[PDB]
Design a protein around this ligand. Structure first.
Ligand code: NWP
Length: 166
């Protein structure tokens, strides 16, 4: 069946106050079927709150929209982010990699989530031995958001624990 609706949503910040449900939909329908699309407004004045959300039919459509950033909607570059599972970071902790996992193992796996800028395999300050964890820094937060919602990460045969790093 369908992926959970929460994983199909994009929170769009930085909207022009002139953006409407209809203009937000017309824009974001370029990357998939929208089952929902709302501009948040004040309950009394109806003036835009400057943000809204869109819900796609599939996760692949969310990916397509994110890959099409930057989005200029009604003349203003907006800020789409996947729904919270927002702590917006570009770096992950990767644990459980033991002593045999190398840079290329992490690169070959994680490069399919986003563009990697730094891989830091952690070693012991005294002995230089690998400590069994690493940090990966990407050029953009959506890579991290995609990573941390997965139930599982398998790298170099290890089932890894992956979390946002700050
Ligand atoms: C040993 C490991 C489990 N940590 C406690 S960490 O390496 O300090 N680490 C640094 C902060 O970001 C990560 C989420 C956590």
């Amino acid at each position: 069946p369908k992926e959970p609706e929460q994983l199909r949503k994009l929170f769009i910040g930085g909207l022009s106050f002139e953006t409407t449900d209809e203009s937000l939909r017309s824009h974001f329908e370029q990357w998939g079927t929208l089952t929902d699309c709302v501009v948040m407004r004040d309950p009394n004045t109806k003036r835009s709150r400057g943000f809204g959300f869109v819900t796609y039919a599939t996760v692949e459509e969310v990916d397509a929209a994110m890959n099409a950033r930057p989005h200029k909607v009604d003349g203003r570059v907006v800020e789409p982010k996947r729904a919270v599972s927002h702590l917006t970071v570009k770096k992950i902790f990767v644990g459980g990699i033991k002593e045999d996992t190398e840079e290329h193992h992490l690169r070959d796996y994680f490069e399919q989530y986003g563009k990697i800028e730094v891989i830091e395999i952690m070693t012991d300050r005294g002995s230089g031995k690998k400590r069994g964890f690493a940090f990966v820094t990407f050029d953009d937060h959506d890579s991290v958001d995609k990573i941390v919602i997965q139930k599982y990460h398998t790298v170099n045969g290890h089932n890894c624990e992956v979390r946002k790093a700050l």
